[PDB]
Design a protein around this motif. Structure first.
Motif, mmCIF file in Angstrom:
data_model
loop_
_atom_site.group_PDB
_atom_site.id
_atom_site.type_symbol
_atom_site.label_atom_id
_atom_site.label_comp_id
_atom_site.label_asym_id
_atom_site.label_seq_id
_atom_site.Cartn_x
_atom_site.Cartn_y
_atom_site.Cartn_z
ATOM 1 N N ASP A 23 0.831 -1.185 0.000
ATOM 2 C CA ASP A 23 0.000 0.000 0.000
ATOM 3 C C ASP A 23 0.876 1.250 0.000
ATOM 4 O OD1 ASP A 23 0.769 -0.274 2.878
ATOM 5 O OD2 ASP A 23 -0.597 1.431 3.102
ATOM 6 N N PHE A 24 0.235 2.401 -0.105
ATOM 7 C CA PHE A 24 0.920 3.684 -0.163
ATOM 8 C C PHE A 24 1.809 3.911 1.060
ATOM 9 C CE2 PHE A 24 1.016 8.288 0.701
ATOM 10 C CZ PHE A 24 1.579 8.741 -0.477
ATOM 11 N N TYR A 25 1.366 3.443 2.219
ATOM 12 C CA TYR A 25 2.064 3.732 3.465
ATOM 13 C C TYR A 25 3.245 2.792 3.694
ATOM 14 C CZ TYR A 25 -1.712 6.943 4.616
ATOM 15 O OH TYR A 25 -2.605 7.990 4.606
ATOM 16 N N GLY A 26 3.346 1.733 2.897
ATOM 17 C CA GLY A 26 4.499 0.869 2.982
ATOM 18 C C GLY A 26 4.361 -0.202 4.041
ATOM 19 N N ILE A 43 -4.074 1.420 -1.359
ATOM 20 C CA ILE A 43 -4.156 1.762 0.053
ATOM 21 C C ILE A 43 -4.797 0.623 0.833
ATOM 22 C CG2 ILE A 43 -4.810 3.474 1.774
ATOM 23 C CD1 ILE A 43 -5.181 4.218 -1.945
ATOM 24 N N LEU A 44 -4.142 0.215 1.911
ATOM 25 C CA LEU A 44 -4.662 -0.822 2.782
ATOM 26 C C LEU A 44 -5.907 -0.280 3.471
ATOM 27 C CD1 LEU A 44 -2.350 -3.015 5.031
ATOM 28 C CD2 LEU A 44 -4.780 -2.700 5.447
ATOM 29 N N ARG A 45 -6.941 -1.107 3.590
ATOM 30 C CA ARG A 45 -8.235 -0.670 4.127
ATOM 31 C C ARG A 45 -8.117 0.004 5.494
ATOM 32 N NH1 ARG A 45 -13.710 -1.799 4.008
ATOM 33 N NH2 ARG A 45 -13.395 -0.967 6.121
ATOM 34 N N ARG A 50 -7.529 7.417 6.552
ATOM 35 C CA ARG A 50 -6.614 8.551 6.600
ATOM 36 C C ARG A 50 -6.398 9.120 5.199
ATOM 37 N NH1 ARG A 50 -6.788 9.990 10.483
ATOM 38 N NH2 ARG A 50 -7.721 11.768 9.356
ATOM 39 N N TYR A 51 -6.107 8.232 4.256
ATOM 40 C CA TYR A 51 -5.767 8.628 2.894
ATOM 41 C C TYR A 51 -6.965 9.243 2.171
ATOM 42 C CZ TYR A 51 -3.504 8.406 -1.682
ATOM 43 O OH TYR A 51 -2.942 8.723 -2.896
ATOM 44 N N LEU A 52 -8.159 8.718 2.431
ATOM 45 C CA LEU A 52 -9.373 9.242 1.814
ATOM 46 C C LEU A 52 -9.659 10.647 2.314
ATOM 47 C CD1 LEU A 52 -11.776 6.168 1.809
ATOM 48 C CD2 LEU A 52 -10.179 6.954 0.052
#
Lengths: 72, 72
Positions: A23-26, A43-45, A50-52
């Protein structure tokens, strides 16, 4: 038998990801993990909320060039 | 003229997609025409509003591997 003046982080052992997506956060997105792709990024659920709230913006592209119609 | 080596053999160097991509329908999207990507899939901005109405940029990728532990 080797020596080390200080405990440094060497490679030790490393492999390449076959088709494992992160995911984006690694973190790590496994086939047994729920995730959402926002436009193109993964992105992990769990980190999704946070990302949304940051983006929720998918992948919005344009010509970017903005060719100026014809002008005359 | 023949016999005299003026020609050499080469491979099919340029076969893979360079900067060329296509939308969901199958037109052709380039960095000249405006487009949006919904979760990995490309859509012309001409039909994108419709796509955001039904998909909304998110590719929801749940595990979908829910094999519940059951011996029989």
């Amino acid at each position: 038998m080797v020596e080390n003046p200080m405990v440094i982080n060497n490679w030790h052992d490393k492999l390449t990801e076959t088709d494992v997506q992160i995911d984006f956060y690694g973190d790590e997105v496994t086939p047994v993990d729920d995730y959402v792709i926002d436009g193109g990024e993964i992105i992990l659920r769990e980190n999704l909320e946070r990302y949304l709230r940051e983006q929720l913006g998918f992948e919005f592209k344009n010509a970017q060039l903005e060719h100026h119609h014809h002008h005359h």
